[PDB]
């Protein structure tokens, strides 16, 4: 089964998931000089005041903080989107060292980690139907650099001890994801895919230009998680990122000059 190791990592995925070599795969390098400013892009609308987190889960690839998506409580709209996308979960990808970890890169620069807030298009009714559509998902990506702590991340960091291994979950209510956003909502946007199997080409990517700062102590705690299940040989959950894939026939647009 797929993973991030030498024998099952990203360069192997195409054997079970041939769309791995497809025309709109993610992540990509964002060449800031080639990205075109598009003055017709609208500001992003992030409406998370009524978000309802429920649970946090180690799924063997990362940890997801899951949200109640049975009603329009935490939605992303505007920007390049038509319609309303509901938050279902967020998770991160990170490195074994601060020098790598992000999925997207910016002029080939790798950040220490990258946060993905995953939303699905409500016109498709549920997440499972949405992934089958080219405009099914909107993922808001936010880079993390190591420096000052992010106060709004600490509640997430502090519960990781309780979900160390694959398949463990913990109650995780009343978490406010507004505490993970940078000051500016300037963004790059392009059409792409999920970045793990099934690698479906159903995502409008919206990657914020401004990274958030997290402390070394915070990201160190990410790296104590495990890929493996309980009572199995310990493999640290580190370097759970897919590298940049060919841009091919796409253009990345910028919301800002
Ligand atoms: Zn992700």
Cα 130 to ligand 1 centre (Å): 16
Cα 120 to ligand 1 centre (Å): 14
C-alpha distances out from residue 77 to 85, 128, 165, 234, Å: 6, 20, 35, 41
Cα 110 to ligand 1 centre (Å): 15
Q: How was this structure determined?
A: X-ray
Q: Which residues pair with 77 in a beta bridge?
A: 45
Cα angle 156, 161, 163 (rounded to 5 degrees) comes to 85
Instruction: Report the alpha-carbon distance of residue 255 to residue 20 in Å, rounded.
Output: 28
Cα 115 to ligand 1 centre (Å): 7
Query: What CATH number does the domain containing 208 carry?
Result: 3.10.200.10
The backbone torsions φ and ψ at residue 145, rounded to the nearest 5 degrees and listed phi first, read -110, 160
What total of structural domains would you count in the chain?
1
The tokens for 241 are 């990122």
CB 68 within 8 A of CB 241: no
Q: Is 19 in a helix, a strand, or coil?
A: helix
Within the chain, where are the H helices?
127-130, 154-158, 216-222
Domain housing 51: 1-257
Cα 117 to ligand 1 centre (Å): 8
Which residues have a beta carbon within 5 Å of ligand 1, which is an ion? Answer: 116
Instruction: Report the alpha-carbon distance of residue 197 to residue 3 in Å, rounded.
Output: 9
Cα 94 to ligand 1 centre (Å): 10
Contacts of 69 (CB under 8 A, 6+ apart): 86, 87, 88, 120, 127
Q: What is the resolution of this structure in A?
A: 1.7
C-alpha count within 13 angstroms, C-beta hemisphere, residue 94: 28
């Amino acid at each position: 089964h797929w993973g991030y190791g030498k024998h099952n990592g990203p360069e192997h995925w195409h054997k079970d998931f041939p769309i791995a070599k497809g025309e709109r795969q993610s992540p990509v390098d964002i060449d800031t000089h080639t990205a075109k400013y598009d003055p017709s892009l609208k500001p992003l609308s992030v409406s998370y005041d009524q978000a309802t987190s429920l649970r946090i889960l180690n799924n063997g690839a990362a940890f997801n903080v899951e949200f109640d998506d049975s009603q329009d409580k935490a939605v992303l709209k505007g920007g390049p989107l038509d319609g309303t996308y509901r938050l279902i979960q967020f998770h991160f990808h990170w490195g074994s060292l601060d020098g790598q970890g992000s999925e997207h890169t910016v002029d080939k620069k790798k950040y220490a980690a990258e946060l993905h807030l995953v939303h699905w298009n409500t016109k498709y009714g549920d997440f499972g139907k949405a992934v089958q559509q080219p405009d099914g998902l909107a993922v808001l990506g936010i880079f993390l650099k190591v420096g000052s702590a992010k106060p709004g991340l600490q509640k997430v960091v502090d519960v990781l001890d309780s979900i160390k291994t694959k398949g463990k979950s913990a109650d995780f209510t009343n978490f406010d994801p507004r505490g993970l956003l940078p000051e500016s909502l300037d963004y790059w946007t392009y059409p792409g895919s999920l970045t793990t199997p099934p690698l479906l080409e159903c995502v409008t990517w919206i990657v914020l230009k401004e990274p958030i700062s997290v402390s070394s102590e915070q990201v160190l705690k990410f790296r104590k998680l495990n890929f493996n299940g309980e009572g199995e040989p310990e493999e640290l959950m580190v370097d759970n990122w897919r590298p940049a894939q060919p841009l091919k026939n796409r253009q990345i647009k910028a919301s800002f000059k």
